[PDB]
């Protein structure tokens, strides 16, 4: 396999389905990347993650650099080896969590959620290399929502400068430039002219993929979709389009209809432990009393191991009892659900009936 | 298979190895029963529990009657069906936890750890039937340690009266008497004459198995072994001898050398989440800093999936990060370790080299 090869096999409107070939494996797109917070996808063995159909997982640079540390993981053989996942892994830059959990043009210094740490385009790229990430995200400065035109521009402009620095830092590292891929991130908040300038900047620098950043920041689905409407088209068509931190089932469908190829969200994972189970008829809260004696599986159609062997009543009991097994089963289900969603999306686009699938999915999901 | 059939295939001193045939499966003895607190063996899927080599698990009547309730589990098809375990299940009477987590000759009434509940020989047996337990424990009155000769006698005497009531209650329930087995419990604290009277009483009533109760109550290994020395021999030889709540590896070996066939302990499970990992060279605390970069498996010889795929450094990181996966891997390992211990015990007795195995095990375990 090549370092990186994105080939589109089918299209329908702005939607695309295809594959990304990488040294560690093939990624079917549109793809959903489960989130591996601290070198683990919450409550799941990597083989179980793989069993759900995931072709790639995402790793949080921020948490990892804090515990167990980038250098240690490197000394231990890398992230893949450390956690037992031998397929592709995409790592974010850590920038978001730094702000979420002293900023300057050089970068950012911060205190661990009490140790002191620094992060910059160069250091972010380095850490991701130490982790052995297959897909590296450029380090940027996120713009809070809402943001003023002046502030959004200043952040996008800095982000673009940082993108060039990420690009150069990535290329200066032989092993990384030859075995990994680099994704740039589009900024500009909700302003079209800024998004356009950002897209132009990233394209001039040149990346293996382009992410749309700054969304899923509490603006609501409509505002997001509206921004995607004009933003994604600005991005190079022959490269993957990655929507960051967007994972609500209905958000994914809409983003794909707008040209997005990759998603990542902690929702299926986090929601799992909180008792939220995804189904084709909408999400349910398994902790609700109505499921105490419900013998049906979490979802009538799901093909995951959980729905084949356990009832809602059992999982209901496990979650309300705080039992670990509850979190295990819920999460396997949710991630499994998500993968089946992506599969249906890929099949529908490939068969030219995705628009219909989108309509059918929403009608039933929101019924 | 028959309702119950205990056959001894080999002996060495007081040690015995054989099998217990039951409707739901064969139990190889000496056996270790993992503990399923609230319809779950902490952090493990039943298939994983089975994968470790366990032939039977134990269910806590007390917790179950509280959440999700005996009647509900029955309505849902029984414990086996509820949790996904189709092999034999032994359920305690709940009496111990009632005292541990208004007593009278009729029984005991208590407040949930705030609901009010009652438990008696009849109700205990009934609940266990509702759960669908394969091996039912007679309901008794535990005697605290230390206990006076007068108090120990009074409790043993009541326990013996309650044993007869458990026996009769069990027999009055057709389905239960025909598909399940009943174990009586020997009491008498550390007094030989009381233990003898207790053994005589239980034998006159007649049970499918005899448990030695009241031990593992903080008396220390020596006192326990000393009590076993004269207690186990009082029990009928052609029936299983079950030591309750004893599971430290070294305790098990010694109890088997004294004629015990069955063990149950929450140690491998509880210790798992606390970071204690069992190895043939003694237990270790994976949370200790010395394992931060240790790439070896939890145990050099273990054949469990955990030791085949993950390092101490990884599990070290998971436990210190409070990650669920840490508890999952630790517990699978510990239970796997325990099953391999029982296998080695069964093989050694079967080959007439158990005494040597006991010596070799202790020498290395305490090295
Ligand atoms: Zn499912
Ligand atoms: Zn192991």
Author numbering:
A (entry chain A), B (entry chain A): 11 to 111, 116 to 127, 130 to 383
Passage from the reporting paper:
In order to investigate the importance of Gly232 and Val161 in human Tgt for queuine recognition, we created a doubly mutated variant of the Z. mobilis enzyme in which the corresponding Val233 and Cys158 were exchanged by glycine and valine, respectively. In addition, we created two further variants, each containing solely one of the above-mentioned amino acid exchanges. To allow the interpretation of the obtained data at a structural level, we determined the crystal structures of the mutated Tgt variants created in this study in their apo-forms as well as in complex with preQ1 and queuine. The replacement of Val233 by glycine results in a considerable gain of space in the substrate binding pocket most probably required for the accommodation of the dihydroxy-cyclopentenyl moiety of queuine. In contrast, under the same conditions a faint band representing the covalent enzyme·tRNA complex was observed for Tgt(Val233Gly) and Tgt(Cys158Val/Val233Gly) indicating that the reinsertion rate of the excised guanine was significantly decreased with these Tgt variants (lanes 5 and 11).
